[PDB]
């Protein structure tokens, strides 16, 4: 084959030993005694240096197999920045879930009800969009890494302004950068969702299930799509140092146990650095399933069984202007087999909050043809956002 | 056009071209330093 190492760029081989070293029963005369190199004397060979007392910073990195947590079986870990090739399909296969296009009917009616809206919804949402895209910073053209979290926080505050006439949103709290770890076996594969998401909402009250018994039963007859050339573990990190322990993000006795909504942000200024929408849906599905599985194992137990009380979690992925919504209902814990009851996942995709935003006025032929502001506006996306926020109450 | 300003000062270039390390890194530069020492120069390099 064609090796990828260039000889002039690899570490050069050590120079050949002096001819005196090849003579049996002959001690070489080297320059080790004078503590400096001198021509004419043989090159002294030294044993590897042993710093009898260990130093933390200046020691060689311990090998991976020396770690006490090293395991022979390989674990496939999904962390925050893992990309899936066939995103939605791979996520559905790994989590044993069935995809549904529309949002749950409960969330849909909660959005469509005009009595759940805020006072001046259109004006307030346009103001939030304008503030996030243009006003929040003194720069002329704010960057995505700045205006994605800002717009998400503005929408969260707009939804939180609902508490005065829905006195049930105070049972929630926000968490940032907590370690989630949930492992499971999926057809002789040791998968593990491990890492941290963007933001999480915790609640005191469990989120009621949204799937009907008829839909859950009809999920049994559904067969998960299989893609042959690509293994299901493509895109995950193959590691050997891991802990098989369903450790959620919080310790025991947390006053806000039940997860409600995960928030994922693609706040990167580069398109290659950002996630594709398919990969984003896959990441939300995987983290929502991991959170639901951790909650179910903390509530009921580690036995692999079909849950009589499903666990439903929500997720919102924001590119800055494109929103993706997830409602994932976990019904089962036994996932090694592919014949039982599967979980459900309603995925609303490619929800455009606004088509485009002009941060500066455009002048064509000495006249302004389009003013400053967001071009095109779909209030239905914010309606869905508010419905997802209010689904708990 | 107008000449005479061929010297644009820069300490990095000065030290990398006529420095002590630059002189001593080659056998010919060591000979230059030895010649300057033999003549008795106050400054052997830059």
């Amino acid at each position: 084959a064609y090796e990828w190492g260039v000889r002039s760029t690899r570490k050069p081989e050590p120079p050949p030993l002096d001819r005196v070293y090849e003579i049996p029963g002959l001690e070489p005369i080297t320059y080790a005694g004078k503590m400096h190199f001198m021509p004419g004397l043989a090159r002294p060979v030294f044993p590897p240096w042993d710093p009898g007392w260990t130093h933390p910073k200046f020691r060689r990195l311990p090998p991976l197999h020396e770690h006490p947590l090293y395991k022979d079986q390989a674990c496939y870990v999904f962390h925050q920045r893992c990309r899936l090739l066939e995103g939605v399909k791979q996520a559905l296969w790994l989590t044993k879930t069935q995809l549904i296009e529309g949002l749950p009917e409960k969330v849909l009616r909660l959005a469509d009800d005009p009595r759940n809206h805020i006072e001046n919804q259109d004006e307030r949402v346009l103001n939030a969009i304008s503030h996030a895209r243009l006003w929040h910073s003194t720069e002329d053209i704010p960057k995505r890494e700045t205006y994605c979290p800002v717009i998400v926080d503005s929408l969260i505050q707009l939804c939180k302004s609902q508490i005065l006439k829905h006195p049930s949103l105070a049972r929630r709290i926000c968490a940032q950068n907590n370690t989630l770890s949930a492992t499971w076996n999926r057809e002789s594969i040791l998968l593990q969702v491990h890492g941290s998401s963007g933001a999480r909402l915790n609640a005191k009250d469990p989120l009621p299930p949204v799937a009907s018994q008829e839909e859950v039963e009809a999920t049994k007859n559904h067969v998960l799509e299989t893609f042959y050339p690509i293994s299901p573990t493509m895109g995950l990190q193959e590691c050997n140092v891991y802990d098989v322990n369903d450790d959620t993000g919080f310790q025991e006795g947390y006053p806000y146990p039940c997860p409600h909504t995960l928030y994922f942000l693609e706040s990167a200024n580069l398109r290659p650095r950002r996630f594709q929408p398919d990969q984003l849906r896959a990441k939300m599905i995987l983290f929502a399933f991991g959170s639901a599985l951790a909650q179910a194992r903390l509530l009921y137990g580690n036995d692999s069984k079909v849950l009589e009380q499903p666990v439903v979690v929500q997720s919102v992925g924001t590119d800055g202007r494109l929103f993706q919504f997830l409602v994932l209902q976990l019904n089962t814990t036994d996932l090694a087999s592919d014949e039982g009851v599967k979980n459900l996942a309603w995925v609303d995709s490619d929800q455009l909050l606004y088509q485009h935003f002009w941060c500066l006025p455009v002048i064509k032929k000495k006249v302004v043809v389009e003013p400053v502001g967001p071009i095109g506006f779909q209030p239905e996306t914010f309606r869905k956002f508010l419905a997802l926020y209010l689904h708990g109450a | 056009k107008a000449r005479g300003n061929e010297y644009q000062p820069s300490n990095i270039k000065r030290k990398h071209k006529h420095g002590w390390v630059r002189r001593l890194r080659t056998p010919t530069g060591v000979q230059v330093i030895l010649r300057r020492m033999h003549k008795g120069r106050k400054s052997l390099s830059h």
Binding site: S130, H136, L169, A170, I173, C174, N178, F250, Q251 | -
Partner: protein
């Protein structure tokens, strides 16, 4: 032109006096006279608010399983900043039912605040412009941890022509010995949002002290009386910059001096301690050309720093002070006049 860069979160020993000199601000201990004409609105649940605050403390100190921290120092910035964010969010959400303006208010997280102003003149000591009169320019580049912006201005604490026997402190020394250093860059006047933002008035700021200005660090540095000086300097600089930004957004400047006092509130939090301040900008004509016959002064009311909790361990708050909670509740229930 060249200008001093005033840092509200400064390590200078006696910085409150210098900031008052730069600002024409008099500092008064204690809260401003309260408007006792308030209706019996505060029927809120002290137990509920205490439970929420304790829940935030416990979540950010013990319940949150973050990534493993190899250093044993356990820095107090990464544990108090999320606490401050969660505390502000929970308090606003719980008190928005009593105070309707908090529902429509905008919460800004670490949004920069800028203010550029002139104060006095100085003879240029060195250079080809030696001997010529040049004004002293200052710029404050602040990044408050949390801000609350409201559509309508808060009511004034004292009349615009308020007279105080205490005079503005004057320093018979150069500003370079604070130490302060001149720099030349874009001089901006920023409120946390552009002028087009309809929420051009502010309600309350929250400022988190850094790890460099901790009480233990100051005690090691042998600065026992600087513990309150740092709070005073941060409050004075930040609140003055933000009130001046509000005033110049409204349209007032040195030659168009302010007609209505601009009121702001500030909460300065260490890892454990809290302090409360109230600022009223009465005059903006701080330049030498307009300060010849300007009797108005800015006023900053201060409160002694009081700890909120006491050495919590194992999801149980040992000591809890209700005075800090009541002060925060009063600041968040301050509302604009209705008309």
């Amino acid at each position: 032109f060249m200008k001093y860069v005033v840092y509200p979160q400064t390590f200078a020993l006696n910085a409150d006096n210098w900031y008052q000199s730069f600002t024409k601000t008099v500092f008064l201990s204690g809260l401003p006279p309260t408007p006792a004409k308030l209706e019996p609105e505060p029927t809120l649940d002290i137990t509920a608010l205490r439970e929420a605050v304790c829940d935030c403390l416990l979540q950010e100190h013990f319940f949150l399983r973050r990534k493993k921290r190899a250093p044993v120092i356990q820095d107090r910035e990464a544990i108090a900043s999320p606490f401050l964010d969660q505390l502000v969010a929970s308090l606003t959400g719980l008190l928005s039912v009593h105070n309707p303006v908090l529902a429509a208010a905008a919460l800004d997280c670490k949004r920069p605040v800028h203010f550029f102003w002139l104060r006095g003149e100085e003879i240029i000591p060195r250079g080809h412009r030696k001997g010529r009169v040049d004004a002293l320019r200052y710029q404050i580049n602040d990044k408050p941890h949390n801000q609350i912006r409201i559509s309508r201005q808060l009511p004034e604490f004292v009349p615009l022509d308020y007279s105080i026997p205490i005079e503005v402190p004057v320093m018979s020394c150069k500003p370079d010995k604070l130490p302060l250093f001149k720099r030349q860059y874009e001089n901006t006047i920023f409120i946390g949002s552009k002028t087009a933002d309809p929420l051009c008035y502010g309600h309350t700021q929250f400022h988190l002290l850094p790890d460099k200005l901790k009480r233990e660090k100051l005690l090691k540095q042998n600065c026992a009386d600087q513990i309150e000086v740092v709070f005073r300097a941060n409050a004075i600089a930040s609140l003055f910059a933000w009130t001046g930004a509000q005033a110049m957004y409204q349209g007032f400047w040195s030659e168009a001096d302010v007609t209505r006092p601009f009121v702001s509130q500030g909460v300065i939090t260490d890892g454990k301690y809290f302090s409360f301040f109230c600022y009223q900008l009465n005059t903006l004509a701080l330049t030498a050309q307009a300060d010849q016959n300007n009797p108005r002064k800015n006023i900053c009311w201060g409160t002694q720093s009081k700890p909120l909790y006491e050495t919590i361990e194992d999801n149980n708050v040992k000591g809890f002070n209700d005075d800090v909670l009541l002060q925060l509740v009063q600041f968040l229930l301050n509302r604009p006049k209705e008309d």
